[PDB]
Amino acid sequence: RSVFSERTEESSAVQYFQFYGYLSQQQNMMQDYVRTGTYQRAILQNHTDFKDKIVLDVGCGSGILSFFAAQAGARKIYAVEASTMAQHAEVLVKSNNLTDRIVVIPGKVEEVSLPEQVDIIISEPMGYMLFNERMLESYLHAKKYLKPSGNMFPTIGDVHLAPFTDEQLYMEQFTKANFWYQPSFHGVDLSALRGAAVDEYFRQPVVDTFDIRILMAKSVKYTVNFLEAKEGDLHRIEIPFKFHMLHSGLVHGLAFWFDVAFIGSIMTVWLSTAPTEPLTHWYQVRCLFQSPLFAKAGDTLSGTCLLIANKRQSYDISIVAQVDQTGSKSSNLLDLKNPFFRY
Amino acid sequence: RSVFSERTEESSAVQYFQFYGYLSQQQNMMQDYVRTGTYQRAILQNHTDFKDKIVLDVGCGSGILSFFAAQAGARKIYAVEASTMAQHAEVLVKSNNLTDRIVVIPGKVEEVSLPEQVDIIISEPMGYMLFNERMLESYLHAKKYLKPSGNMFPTIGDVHLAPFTDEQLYMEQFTKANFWYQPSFHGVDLSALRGAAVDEYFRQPVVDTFDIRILMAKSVKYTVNFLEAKEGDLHRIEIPFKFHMLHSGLVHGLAFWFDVAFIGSIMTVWLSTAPTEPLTHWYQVRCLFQSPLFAKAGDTLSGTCLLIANKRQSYDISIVAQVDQTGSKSSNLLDLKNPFFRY
Amino acid sequence: SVFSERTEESSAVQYFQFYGYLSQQQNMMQDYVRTGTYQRAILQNHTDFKDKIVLDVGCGSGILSFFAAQAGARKIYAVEASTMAQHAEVLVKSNNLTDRIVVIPGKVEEVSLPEQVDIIISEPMGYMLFNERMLESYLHAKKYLKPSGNMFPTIGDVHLAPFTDEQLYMEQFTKANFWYQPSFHGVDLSALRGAAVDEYFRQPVVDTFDIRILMAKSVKYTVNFLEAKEGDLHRIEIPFKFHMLHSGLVHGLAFWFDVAFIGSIMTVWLSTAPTEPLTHWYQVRCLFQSPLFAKAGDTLSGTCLLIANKRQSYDISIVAQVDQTGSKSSNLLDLKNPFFRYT
Amino acid sequence: SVFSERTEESSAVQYFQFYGYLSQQQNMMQDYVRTGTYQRAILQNHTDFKDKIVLDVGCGSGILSFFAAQAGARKIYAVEASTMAQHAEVLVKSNNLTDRIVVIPGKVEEVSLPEQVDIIISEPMGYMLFNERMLESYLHAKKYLKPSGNMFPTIGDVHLAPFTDEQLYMEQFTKANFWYQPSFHGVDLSALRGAAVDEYFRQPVVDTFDIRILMAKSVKYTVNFLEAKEGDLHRIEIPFKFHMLHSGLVHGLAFWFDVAFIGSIMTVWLSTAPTEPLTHWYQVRCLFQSPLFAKAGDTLSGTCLLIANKRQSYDISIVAQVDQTGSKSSNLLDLKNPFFRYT
Ligand SMILES: NCCCN(CC[C@H](N)C(=O)O)C[C@H]1O[C@@H](n2cnc3c(N)ncnc32)[C@H](O)[C@@H]1O
Ligand SMILES: NCCCN(CC[C@H](N)C(=O)O)C[C@H]1O[C@@H](n2cnc3c(N)ncnc32)[C@H](O)[C@@H]1O
Ligand SMILES: NCCCN(CC[C@H](N)C(=O)O)C[C@H]1O[C@@H](n2cnc3c(N)ncnc32)[C@H](O)[C@@H]1O
Ligand SMILES: NCCCN(CC[C@H](N)C(=O)O)C[C@H]1O[C@@H](n2cnc3c(N)ncnc32)[C@H](O)[C@@H]1O
């Protein structure tokens, strides 16, 4: 009867936590130097926000963030982890002689019991498009243990949206669906499913990186303040947008990336996944329109990106975009849980 | 009234003979050095087939072929031309002091009267894919003026067929038809016409040249013997084919070209539009399948190319192809009258 | 009918066969300036359409009728003579507008319409505005227009300006000089050179150009579609007197056109001028047979006489003289068969 | 049901969600070797299908049922448990086969069939043949097979062979040695290097390889689907005795499989051997924890024990020893989490 079990299908949760039980996946994340190094810089440069403080690390995995908090002088760190990785974290705590300061609490943060309130919560809950995996809600849920005067690292999150043009990517996905147009595949007529196939392929967010010159307008920003937001705020996320087109051409979809800010007492440290910044394991995310929209420089592209949380720990993405001057409209549905990894 | 008028719509004939009434189009054909030079070599190298003979030039245009026949020693050349170019040809006959050997007969070869039977017929009746413009029927119809043992230049014509792979051409035509998939073009849903647009764009034979490495099998040859053929034989041309695939991959359609041979007493001279040979104003022609067929090397691709002559001086092309081992079948109907010039 | 009495059947067949292709409708719909300006003119004057009866002359795909429906018209009669009428009816059904738009297949001069309309919409402009002679169908349709009705477009302005283009003028002789050789494969072609030159100079040149070739502000000839009669377009006499801004040789006259939608809220302009973004009409240039030298400050006076023919086009007669010098030149062009020079 | 009692719910959900994607069906259909061989086997044994009753276990898109229909089958019951069943029904309708193919949505262990069948067709092979445990569904379905009924495929051969691949072996420690560093961002990771090594070696390597890495003739283990029962697949003991053709270090065992369609007219083989063209099954290699040195002429004897688990896969235990030296090696592998190494 936990909020996690009430919002998550068991099949999804089992697969999710088996995935994060593998050391190879921990290694993959740790070897993202931009992520790991920016987190260490955020915590150590703001060491006075940790010195002799009580810390909660939500989803500690291998424990790396808890060790950073220990390096910064934290009095006690409660490292919560639901996967079997919790046992490997304990091994590292002992072999690094930090048993007196890092306490691994196995289980889900929505289901464990902590012995005290904490001064600061640290976590790495960002997925693709920031919101995938629905771990932000576990991060916000954990604020029940946070002191009124407490802080959170990261403190805020910016989602950036921008229209792009990429005929090669659009053609690439259409070529895959063209298989289901065949009138005689080994003598079988498949064309009747051509519609279902296009929908399925264009339902896939494309995870990869791209040249910034494909972006056709200054990005739009949607900000989530983790200190202020509540869990329920992430069940439905409505992001309006109005782009002033800087170039003429076809808009094949919207590109997404995110920044998070660790707003400490000493300085604010940013971790960015923008295409102008060094690449991370989050790359960037692009959602294609089933049909591209034409716009000239000076036109306006308006609409809404609506994310609806589902019980598979992801979101159903509804994107409606409209060229204001012409009424040229594009509606699209995307399944954020199952992206197409193009890199 | 005449054989020509019964098989031809008046509007098509008006446009057709207006077209060839332009000196700029005659210049275009004369500056095809491969064509003009090969005809001259075929006629002069076989000067004995013209020396002191009576000649009929069907569709003399500017009269260039008649001048070649005169150079080869013909006693009398009847040059029949239906467009207003006939008056320009008469100007050239006079300025070249050949009034005693070249007699221009204004009118259609199916309607004019000649004083005598001729020893040899010369003409350039080949269009795109050999048969476009239906001038071969006029060429064969002129045999009513040919002596029993007379000759014809060209004597035979070979149509070559071969499967090709060209995903860029296929996607290019699909991209153009994709326009009619839009659900909101300026607020208007065009998708209901997607089927009709694809059918229209893929009805166009693609006229241009290509690298021979796109061909996936040795070509199949269909021979027309102009000495034996009857004009009626060209109303319905059924070309069966069986290719033995040399390469594995997608077959996007069939490529067409043609060779004509001048079989003379001294030597046989070939005029080829094959992609291995220097380019001509005929280029090559490719008929796309609406959906490509997969075949592995060693498979056989069988079917029929059916050409039905229409009243617009062209052909309706039906291509049915099948991979024998798998039953994968592809069909297409093409309108040879209105091709896509891609060069 | 009025149409059949002014049009040769062969021209009509070719004309409506041409517009029966979705690819030709698409070519015009993809002209963003044209389609976007029409939409802006109709929607920004929504009060001229809301709850009113509309006639769309030559609706083609129906796009303009859909814009009129977007503006709130109660009933739109969409008349189309080509087989595009069947595709238009499909779009009316698939956009759920059978209660508002009625497609009427046939020529506007021949069909029966039940009632008078409040506003007529159409896009009847060709090259130089008048080519295709469709404006006469537009004006003929006013027999269905209420005394207080409106016309969209309301007026049309054709612009004339002198130009200098040494390359364009010399190109005609470079092409015609192909005929000025004494032994083209042993044939003396020189007797036809003059005929070749005349043929090239009779072709208006369709393409665009740098505005810096223009030697004077254009002269404007205005057709008020609300007051004009279709008989006013059979003979169009455009007298001109250019005040030369630059000194040099005038090689001919350049043509473009504007149309204006004069609505209750605002006037919207569609321009094909070389100072504006290119459209599928490009611009048209007609050469003088001999260049005229004109000093800055001189006056270039003359007449451009457009005489309608039964090929749905015009014979163009241009006479020009330099007033200060008396230097005179003329030309007579066939607009039905222009030279497409654009690359 | 029998399925629900051998399968954890979470695994089954993920399993049938995976196969509900048209892109996954397409991936299998585009394996020409697989799809073409199945068609050959069915069509070349038309006498085993003509006017027969057929059961297709896990029809997916229905491709195999359409092959059975092409062979003249009287009635085909196509059973599919994922949402792909709804797409197969759409194809049966669009191919006008509703009189012959009855799609039954559900698990073959749970649905009810209206009659007994003459032959069962299916493609139940996973990696290493047995992965996914779908063969048990194939055998379970024999409760509907008549006493003289047939099975397509009829038998399955698993081939085991020792290999040497120094690079593959070394790659494991290169990856695991990430953890053997004393200050990863100030953290000593070395205590987990052993666990990381164990995790990597527990992964069967899926890719292809040069046949020259094989050190002996393969050993074969045959499953006769006509005679076998579901229970026979829960514990699979494969003893082996290899006679080393080459001297060197044996780093593990390579796996591949064949199936044979034993029909009345001919037997057709589908092979995934490394000597045959590649399929989407590739081959599988299981490394030994410690390599074994063997001289040409020595004997490598041991056992490969496959124990089914409720994640629809197998726990693999391999024990091998060089008979002439007594040098011994083991390994435990989890076939559910393979390393896809192919590039
Ligand atoms: N691409 C996003 C990486 C998130 N990843 C952080 C890894 C750790 N910060 C590191 O770098 O070492 C999630 C980790 O947090 C765990 N996790 C999830 N959700 C709950 C939850 N509700 N309760 C407890 N742990 C969770 C998850 O198992 C897993 O290990
Ligand atoms: N690929 C074919 C085009 C070649 N074109 C010039 C050939 C000439 N030998 C040259 O090289 O200049 C044909 C010419 O033949 C004429 N032509 C057609 N059909 C009848 C016909 N039925 N009767 C008389 N002339 C014809 C046609 O007008 C036209 O000028
Ligand atoms: N550049 C010229 C306009 C092309 N085209 C506009 C199509 C549509 N309105 C749009 O703007 O998208 C004209 C269309 O009108 C038709 N047309 C002609 N003349 C008669 C006529 N006399 N009667 C009926 N229709 C006509 C013609 O076939 C044709 O499709
Ligand atoms: N070794 C690869 C199997 C691929 N695939 C065959 C598809 C189709 N026959 C083809 O050849 O293209 C399995 C398919 O069988 C289904 N399937 C599984 N197990 C049950 C089961 N127990 N009951 C019903 N269907 C099943 C599965 O969902 C899935 O679509």
Side-chain angles (χ1 to χ4, degrees):
Chain A
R1 63 198 300 176
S2 70
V3 309
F4 181 88
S5 64
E6 289 304 297
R7 72 169 172 77
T8 310
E9 287 178 3
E10 184 167 351
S11 50
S12 181
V14 172
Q15 177 189 233
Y16 181 84
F17 290 117
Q18 281 176 357
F19 175 90
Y20 281 114
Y22 287 101
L23 292 163
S24 65
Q25 178 56 34
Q26 293 295 329
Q27 172 175 352
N28 181 84
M29 297 182 289
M30 297 164 75
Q31 283 187 289
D32 183 343
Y33 179 67
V34 176
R35 180 207 83 124
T36 306
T38 304
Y39 260 90
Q40 191 182 31
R41 187 168 66 253
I43 290 172
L44 294 186
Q45 296 285 27
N46 293 287
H47 62 270
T48 57
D49 293 324
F50 295 83
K51 184 61 178 171
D52 298 325
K53 303 299 190 70
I54 299 157
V55 184
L56 170 56
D57 176 8
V58 181
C60 69
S62 66
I64 188 71
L65 299 191
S66 288
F67 290 108
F68 295 167
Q71 289 166 6
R75 178 189 305 265
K76 183 125 289 187
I77 302 135
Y78 299 101
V80 180
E81 173 57 44
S83 80
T84 60
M85 191 58 50
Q87 286 122 60
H88 300 308
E90 294 168 13
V91 173
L92 290 181
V93 173
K94 287 188 170 186
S95 53
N96 283 271
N97 299 121
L98 287 167
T99 56
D100 59 327
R101 295 174 57 190
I102 299 173
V103 184
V104 175
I105 309 298
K108 302 166 192 171
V109 69
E110 300 91 346
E111 295 172 6
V112 300
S113 193
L114 288 188
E116 54 181 327
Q117 307 294 95
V118 305
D119 297 292
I120 181 163
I121 303 176
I122 61 174
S123 184
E124 200 262 76
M126 304 89 73
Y128 297 132
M129 276 182 66
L130 181 56
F131 300 111
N132 188 48
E133 300 186 34
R134 281 237 256 166
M135 189 167 170
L136 284 174
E137 287 168 54
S138 304
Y139 187 46
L140 296 180
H141 179 94
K143 289 161 65 178
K144 70 185 185 183
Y145 294 114
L146 184 61
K147 292 179 189 187
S149 57
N151 202 9
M152 297 183 79
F153 266 39
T155 318
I156 64 155
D158 293 335
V159 180
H160 288 261
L161 298 73
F164 73 86
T165 180
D166 195 329
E167 187 177 23
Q168 184 178 9
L169 176 58
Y170 180 83
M171 287 290 108
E172 182 174 335
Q173 294 302 85
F174 235 101
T175 299
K176 292 179 204 186
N178 192 65
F179 173 84
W180 297 97
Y181 286 68
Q182 282 179 90
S184 178
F185 176 77
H186 293 260
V188 183
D189 186 352
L190 310 178
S191 63
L193 293 176
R194 69 201 183 267
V198 169
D199 299 337
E200 183 181 308
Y201 280 110
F202 281 78
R203 194 183 303 141
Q204 294 190 276
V206 178
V207 179
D208 74 339
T209 190
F210 52 81
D211 190 294
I212 56 161
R213 281 169 294 192
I214 74 171
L215 300 175
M216 302 177 73
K218 177 168 179 285
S219 67
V220 158
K221 187 203 293 178
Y222 185 85
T223 299
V224 182
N225 185 322
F226 302 132
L227 279 167
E228 300 298 335
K230 295 177 173 181
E231 297 169 78
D233 300 336
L234 300 180
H235 297 356
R236 185 179 184 274
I237 305 172
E238 188 174 10
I239 307 172
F241 56 81
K242 187 172 181 181
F243 297 109
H244 198 97
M245 302 303 296
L246 304 173
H247 302 104
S248 302
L250 296 173
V251 178
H252 291 96
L254 300 180
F256 298 78
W257 66 87
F258 66 87
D259 307 321
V260 296
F262 309 81
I263 304 173
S265 296
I266 295 170
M267 64 176 63
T268 296
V269 176
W270 289 89
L271 167 57
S272 179
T273 60
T276 51
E277 296 289 327
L279 194 61
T280 80
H281 79 275
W282 290 288
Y283 302 83
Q284 292 85 40
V285 182
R286 275 184 291 178
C287 301
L288 287 165
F289 300 150
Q290 288 198 359
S291 181
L293 300 171
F294 182 81
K296 288 234 290 193
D299 282 341
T300 303
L301 183 68
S302 294
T304 292
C305 171
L306 183 65
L307 304 98
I308 308 300
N310 59 41
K311 295 203 174 178
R312 294 170 294 145
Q313 297 176 89
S314 191
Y315 286 79
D316 303 310
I317 293 165
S318 169
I319 299 173
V320 183
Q322 193 186 237
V323 182
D324 298 336
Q325 289 66 24
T326 64
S328 301
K329 184 181 175 170
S330 187
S331 305
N332 304 273
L333 185 71
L334 294 100
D335 181 27
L336 183 55
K337 187 64 177 293
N338 298 98
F340 164 43
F341 309 101
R342 189 168 180 242
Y343 185 86
Chain B
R1 192 75 180 85
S2 75
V3 171
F4 180 92
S5 64
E6 290 299 315
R7 69 169 174 81
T8 310
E9 293 172 9
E10 184 165 352
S11 57
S12 184
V14 173
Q15 180 180 347
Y16 180 83
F17 289 119
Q18 278 181 1
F19 177 87
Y20 284 112
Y22 283 95
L23 288 164
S24 62
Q25 251 299 327
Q26 295 293 334
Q27 168 179 350
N28 252 83
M29 297 180 289
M30 296 164 74
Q31 281 182 309
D32 185 338
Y33 181 69
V34 176
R35 181 206 85 126
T36 305
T38 302
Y39 264 89
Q40 191 183 34
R41 183 166 70 254
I43 289 170
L44 297 184
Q45 293 289 85
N46 291 290
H47 59 274
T48 55
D49 295 318
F50 296 87
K51 183 59 180 170
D52 298 322
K53 301 299 188 73
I54 309 303
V55 185
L56 171 56
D57 179 7
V58 184
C60 72
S62 59
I64 188 73
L65 268 47
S66 292
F67 289 109
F68 295 165
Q71 292 168 6
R75 177 177 91 80
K76 197 75 144 177
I77 304 136
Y78 296 104
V80 180
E81 172 59 41
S83 80
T84 58
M85 190 56 49
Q87 296 308 297
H88 294 311
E90 176 57 17
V91 170
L92 289 179
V93 172
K94 290 179 118 74
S95 56
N96 283 268
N97 297 316
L98 284 162
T99 58
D100 60 318
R101 288 190 266 281
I102 300 173
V103 185
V104 173
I105 304 298
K108 301 174 186 70
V109 71
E110 297 88 343
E111 296 172 5
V112 298
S113 297
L114 288 183
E116 53 178 332
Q117 304 291 91
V118 305
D119 298 288
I120 181 166
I121 305 176
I122 63 177
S123 182
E124 195 262 79
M126 303 91 72
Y128 296 135
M129 214 184 291
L130 183 58
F131 298 110
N132 188 41
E133 303 179 36
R134 290 190 74 181
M135 188 168 170
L136 284 169
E137 291 169 63
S138 301
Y139 188 46
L140 297 178
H141 179 96
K143 279 195 290 190
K144 70 183 182 181
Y145 288 119
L146 190 54
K147 294 176 190 186
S149 290
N151 198 0
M152 296 185 79
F153 265 41
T155 319
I156 65 157
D158 291 337
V159 180
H160 289 261
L161 297 74
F164 74 88
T165 180
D166 195 329
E167 191 170 45
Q168 307 302 330
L169 176 60
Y170 180 82
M171 287 288 114
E172 177 177 331
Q173 300 301 92
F174 218 82
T175 299
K176 294 181 200 187
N178 193 63
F179 174 88
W180 298 94
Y181 286 61
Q182 284 174 86
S184 181
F185 174 77
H186 297 256
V188 183
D189 186 348
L190 310 180
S191 59
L193 293 178
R194 63 201 183 265
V198 168
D199 292 337
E200 181 182 311
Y201 276 111
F202 277 80
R203 272 178 247 151
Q204 297 189 262
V206 183
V207 178
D208 73 339
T209 188
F210 51 81
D211 190 286
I212 56 163
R213 273 114 58 182
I214 72 170
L215 298 179
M216 300 177 70
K218 179 169 182 290
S219 63
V220 160
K221 191 182 70 178
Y222 182 86
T223 300
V224 180
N225 187 334
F226 301 137
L227 283 167
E228 298 296 324
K230 307 164 175 181
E231 61 192 299
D233 299 334
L234 303 182
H235 299 355
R236 179 181 175 93
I237 308 172
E238 193 163 24
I239 304 174
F241 56 83
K242 187 167 178 182
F243 300 106
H244 301 268
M245 303 301 295
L246 304 173
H247 303 279
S248 302
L250 296 175
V251 178
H252 288 99
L254 296 185
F256 299 77
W257 67 87
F258 67 89
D259 311 323
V260 297
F262 306 84
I263 306 172
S265 296
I266 297 171
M267 63 171 63
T268 299
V269 175
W270 287 90
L271 172 53
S272 174
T273 62
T276 48
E277 296 285 334
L279 195 58
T280 75
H281 77 272
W282 290 287
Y283 300 81
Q284 293 83 39
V285 184
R286 280 184 289 175
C287 298
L288 284 160
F289 298 147
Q290 293 198 39
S291 193
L293 298 171
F294 181 79
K296 277 251 204 288
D299 284 333
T300 50
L301 181 71
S302 291
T304 296
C305 170
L306 185 65
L307 307 88
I308 311 300
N310 58 43
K311 296 255 283 166
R312 294 172 294 141
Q313 300 176 88
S314 191
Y315 283 79
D316 306 307
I317 300 165
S318 179
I319 298 173
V320 179
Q322 195 183 42
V323 182
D324 297 335
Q325 289 69 25
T326 63
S328 297
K329 185 192 255 204
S330 191
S331 303
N332 195 13
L333 184 67
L334 294 98
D335 183 30
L336 184 54
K337 184 67 176 290
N338 298 94
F340 164 46
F341 305 99
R342 185 172 181 242
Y343 187 81
Chain C
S1 75
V2 168
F3 182 90
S4 65
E5 289 296 317
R6 69 168 172 81
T7 306
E8 181 178 354
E9 184 164 317
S10 55
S11 186
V13 175
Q14 180 182 232
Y15 180 80
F16 292 115
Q17 279 178 357
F18 177 88
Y19 281 113
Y21 287 97
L22 291 164
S23 58
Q24 296 301 336
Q25 300 290 338
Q26 169 181 348
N27 180 78
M28 300 180 294
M29 296 158 75
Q30 280 182 128
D31 186 331
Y32 189 76
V33 178
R34 185 205 81 129
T35 307
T37 304
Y38 263 88
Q39 191 181 30
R40 185 168 72 252
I42 292 168
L43 294 180
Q44 292 289 97
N45 288 288
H46 60 268
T47 56
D48 289 310
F49 291 89
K50 182 168 178 66
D51 292 322
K52 289 160 173 282
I53 312 301
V54 182
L55 169 55
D56 176 13
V57 180
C59 70
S61 68
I63 187 73
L64 297 190
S65 292
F66 291 113
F67 296 162
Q70 291 169 4
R74 181 178 183 176
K75 177 85 144 175
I76 303 135
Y77 297 96
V79 181
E80 171 55 49
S82 80
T83 59
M84 194 55 48
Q86 290 100 12
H87 299 310
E89 181 62 23
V90 170
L91 294 182
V92 173
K93 290 181 174 183
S94 56
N95 282 271
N96 302 290
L97 287 166
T98 55
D99 63 323
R100 307 261 301 286
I101 302 169
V102 60
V103 176
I104 300 175
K107 304 172 186 71
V108 70
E109 298 90 345
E110 296 179 6
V111 300
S112 296
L113 297 183
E115 58 181 314
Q116 300 226 94
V117 304
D118 299 293
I119 181 164
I120 301 176
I121 64 179
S122 182
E123 119 74 342
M125 304 91 71
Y127 298 132
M128 274 177 62
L129 181 56
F130 300 108
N131 187 42
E132 304 178 33
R133 289 189 65 181
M134 185 173 171
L135 278 165
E136 290 165 47
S137 302
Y138 187 44
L139 298 178
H140 176 96
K142 283 197 297 184
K143 68 186 184 176
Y144 298 115
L145 185 61
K146 293 181 190 186
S148 59
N150 199 5
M151 303 269 289
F152 262 41
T154 318
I155 66 156
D157 299 325
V158 66
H159 288 262
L160 274 73
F163 72 88
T164 181
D165 195 337
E166 195 67 36
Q167 301 288 25
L168 175 60
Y169 183 85
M170 169 168 166
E171 174 185 339
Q172 310 310 313
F173 297 94
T174 302
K175 291 191 294 188
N177 283 337
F178 163 82
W179 299 94
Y180 203 65
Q181 55 184 296
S183 181
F184 174 80
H185 296 259
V187 182
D188 184 337
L189 302 177
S190 60
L192 293 179
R193 190 268 200 169
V197 172
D198 174 83
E199 180 180 296
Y200 283 121
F201 270 83
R202 278 175 49 83
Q203 291 192 273
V205 181
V206 177
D207 75 339
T208 189
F209 50 82
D210 190 291
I211 55 163
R212 285 146 49 198
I213 70 170
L214 301 174
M215 297 169 69
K217 174 58 187 158
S218 65
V219 161
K220 195 179 69 175
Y221 184 97
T222 298
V223 181
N224 185 330
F225 301 134
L226 279 169
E227 297 299 329
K229 308 155 65 70
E230 58 186 309
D232 297 337
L233 302 181
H234 298 163
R235 178 188 173 276
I236 308 173
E237 187 176 8
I238 308 173
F240 55 81
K241 181 180 176 181
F242 299 110
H243 307 271
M244 304 303 295
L245 300 172
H246 301 277
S247 307
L249 304 179
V250 180
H251 290 98
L253 299 180
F255 297 76
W256 65 86
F257 69 87
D258 307 329
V259 297
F261 306 81
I262 304 171
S264 294
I265 296 172
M266 61 175 67
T267 298
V268 175
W269 282 92
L270 170 56
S271 177
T272 62
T275 50
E276 297 289 309
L278 196 60
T279 78
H280 77 275
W281 288 288
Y282 302 88
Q283 291 84 39
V284 180
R285 280 183 293 175
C286 295
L287 289 166
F288 298 142
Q289 293 192 125
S290 296
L292 301 169
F293 170 67
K295 298 162 288 194
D298 286 343
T299 43
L300 179 61
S301 68
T303 292
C304 169
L305 186 63
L306 309 171
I307 305 171
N309 58 44
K310 292 205 175 180
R311 296 175 291 152
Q312 298 178 270
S313 193
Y314 288 79
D315 304 293
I316 304 164
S317 180
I318 301 171
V319 185
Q321 74 164 7
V322 180
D323 296 333
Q324 288 72 21
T325 312
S327 190
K328 191 177 179 171
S329 188
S330 74
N331 194 7
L332 177 71
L333 299 98
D334 177 31
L335 183 54
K336 182 59 180 291
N337 300 100
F339 175 49
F340 296 101
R341 186 172 179 259
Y342 179 78
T343 59
Chain D
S1 74
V2 169
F3 183 88
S4 64
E5 288 299 315
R6 70 167 172 80
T7 307
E8 184 178 359
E9 184 170 28
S10 49
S11 184
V13 171
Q14 179 186 341
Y15 179 81
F16 290 118
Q17 278 180 358
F18 178 84
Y19 282 110
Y21 286 95
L22 292 163
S23 60
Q24 293 301 335
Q25 298 295 336
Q26 171 177 349
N27 182 76
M28 301 181 293
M29 297 159 79
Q30 281 175 322
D31 184 330
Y32 184 80
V33 179
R34 183 202 83 123
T35 308
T37 302
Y38 263 90
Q39 193 184 30
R40 280 181 61 221
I42 291 170
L43 293 182
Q44 293 293 309
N45 287 287
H46 59 269
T47 58
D48 290 288
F49 293 93
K50 193 170 194 68
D51 297 323
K52 304 288 192 182
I53 297 168
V54 183
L55 166 55
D56 183 13
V57 180
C59 70
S61 67
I63 183 66
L64 294 190
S65 297
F66 291 112
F67 292 164
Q70 291 171 7
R74 176 179 181 175
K75 181 64 57 53
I76 302 137
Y77 298 104
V79 181
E80 172 60 41
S82 74
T83 62
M84 190 57 47
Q86 288 110 72
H87 297 309
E89 298 162 7
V90 170
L91 291 181
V92 174
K93 294 174 180 180
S94 56
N95 286 268
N96 299 321
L97 283 164
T98 52
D99 57 327
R100 295 211 269 158
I101 299 173
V102 182
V103 176
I104 297 178
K107 300 165 190 173
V108 71
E109 302 85 349
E110 297 174 3
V111 301
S112 61
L113 241 63
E115 57 181 328
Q116 300 296 89
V117 307
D118 294 290
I119 181 163
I120 300 174
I121 62 178
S122 180
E123 196 273 276
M125 301 92 72
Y127 293 135
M128 217 182 292
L129 183 55
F130 301 109
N131 187 42
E132 303 179 37
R133 290 188 71 181
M134 184 173 170
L135 279 168
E136 289 163 50
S137 300
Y138 186 44
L139 297 181
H140 180 89
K142 284 157 69 181
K143 69 184 182 180
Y144 294 120
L145 188 62
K146 296 178 189 186
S148 295
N150 202 356
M151 305 275 289
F152 259 44
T154 317
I155 65 97
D157 293 330
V158 184
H159 290 262
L160 297 75
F163 74 90
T164 179
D165 192 331
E166 191 69 34
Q167 309 284 53
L168 174 57
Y169 185 87
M170 194 180 309
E171 178 185 334
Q172 309 311 308
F173 292 94
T174 306
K175 289 189 296 190
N177 281 340
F178 163 82
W179 297 91
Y180 202 67
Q181 56 180 304
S183 184
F184 179 79
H185 297 263
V187 182
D188 183 342
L189 305 175
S190 60
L192 292 177
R193 189 267 196 171
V197 170
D198 176 83
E199 178 178 301
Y200 282 120
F201 271 85
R202 285 177 58 83
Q203 293 194 96
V205 180
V206 177
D207 72 339
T208 192
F209 50 83
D210 190 290
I211 58 161
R212 288 174 293 194
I213 72 171
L214 298 174
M215 304 293 283
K217 177 166 176 288
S218 69
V219 165
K220 194 179 70 174
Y221 182 86
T222 297
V223 180
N224 185 324
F225 302 135
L226 283 168
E227 298 172 345
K229 299 171 175 181
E230 297 176 67
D232 297 333
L233 300 182
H234 298 167
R235 175 187 179 277
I236 307 174
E237 184 175 22
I238 306 173
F240 55 80
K241 201 120 190 176
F242 296 112
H243 309 276
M244 303 301 295
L245 301 170
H246 303 105
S247 309
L249 299 178
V250 179
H251 292 106
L253 299 180
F255 296 78
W256 67 89
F257 64 87
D258 305 323
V259 299
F261 305 87
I262 305 171
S264 294
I265 295 169
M266 62 175 69
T267 295
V268 179
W269 286 90
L270 171 54
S271 178
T272 64
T275 48
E276 297 287 317
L278 195 60
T279 78
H280 76 275
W281 289 288
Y282 299 85
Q283 295 82 36
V284 184
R285 282 183 287 175
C286 300
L287 289 161
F288 293 141
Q289 293 188 0
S290 306
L292 300 170
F293 171 67
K295 302 179 292 299
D298 284 348
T299 303
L300 184 70
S301 67
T303 294
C304 171
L305 185 62
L306 312 171
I307 307 168
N309 59 44
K310 293 205 173 178
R311 297 171 293 139
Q312 297 176 272
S313 198
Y314 284 81
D315 305 303
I316 303 166
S317 177
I318 299 171
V319 180
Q321 72 171 11
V322 183
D323 294 333
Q324 291 68 24
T325 68
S327 190
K328 181 189 175 169
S329 191
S330 300
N331 195 5
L332 285 160
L333 297 99
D334 185 36
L335 183 54
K336 185 61 178 293
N337 172 250
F339 176 52
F340 187 84
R341 186 170 180 262
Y342 186 79
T343 55

